[PDB]
Design a protein around this ligand. Structure first.
Ligand SMILES: *[C@@H]1O[C@H](CO)[C@@H](O[C@@H]2O[C@H](CO)[C@@H](O)[C@H](O)[C@H]2NC(C)=O)[C@H](O)[C@H]1NC(C)=O
Ligand SMILES: *[C@@H]1O[C@H](CO)[C@@H](O)[C@H](O)[C@H]1NC(C)=O
Lengths: 46, 23, 49, 33
């Protein structure tokens, strides 16, 4: 009966693997808007 | 005289929309 | 499609997002265009991929 | 009665509502918080 209270009121190891994957997938998309030393980030502009 | 702003002089940096995105 | 400069591809759909009278377009986290406003009729349209 | 401030290059954190309006902000060069 106390497990149920302590949880109903701790899953950080499961939350961290979700967070890490999302933080990496966002960094991947946010790189589609860097120049890396070009005139723009859009191929329809070059 | 001089006075103190508190949180004043914020403008929308441009067009574009946005929902709940800490920009 | 091309909306006065915005060049893209996708399905266009009627929106329901109240684009404040002064907001040209919709910005999505990770920064991809996902809504536009039609210049002539001034209605918001979502741009699904 | 009127005031005159001046503008400098800062970095801010704007909180956007669900209608798309700025409701709060953070000036990121005030203190440690
Ligand atoms: C663009 O042109 C259209 C007409 O082709 C204008 O349209 C009318 O839109 C209003 C809505 O506010 C209706 O009440 C009228 O009945 C429409 N007229 C017709 C003949 O359908 C539209 O307002 C114009 N928009 C701009 C920004 O110029
Ligand atoms: C604007 O925002 C308020 C509160 O965030 C919401 O209740 C309302 O539906 C929104 N749209 C309006 C007022 O058109």
């Amino acid at each position: 009966g106390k497990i149920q209270d302590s949880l109903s009121s701790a899953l950080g190891k499961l939350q961290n693997v979700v967070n890490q994957n999302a933080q990496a997938l966002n960094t991947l998309v946010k790189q589609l808007s860097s120049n890396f030393g070009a005139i723009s980030s859009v191929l329809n502009d070059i | 005289a001089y006075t103190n702003s508190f949180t004043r002089g914020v403008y929308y940096p441009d067009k574009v929309f946005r929902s709940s995105v800490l920009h | 499609f091309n909306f006065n400069g915005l060049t893209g591809t996708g399905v266009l759909t009627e929106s329901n997002k109240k684009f404040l009278p002064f907001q040209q377009f919709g910005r999505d986290i990770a920064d991809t265009t996902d809504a536009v406003r039609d210049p002539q009729t001034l209605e918001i349209l979502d741009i699904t991929p | 009665a009127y005031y005159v401030g001046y503008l400098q290059p800062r970095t801010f954190l704007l909180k956007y509502n669900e209608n798309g309006t700025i409701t709060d902000a953070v000036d990121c060069a005030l203190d440690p918080l």
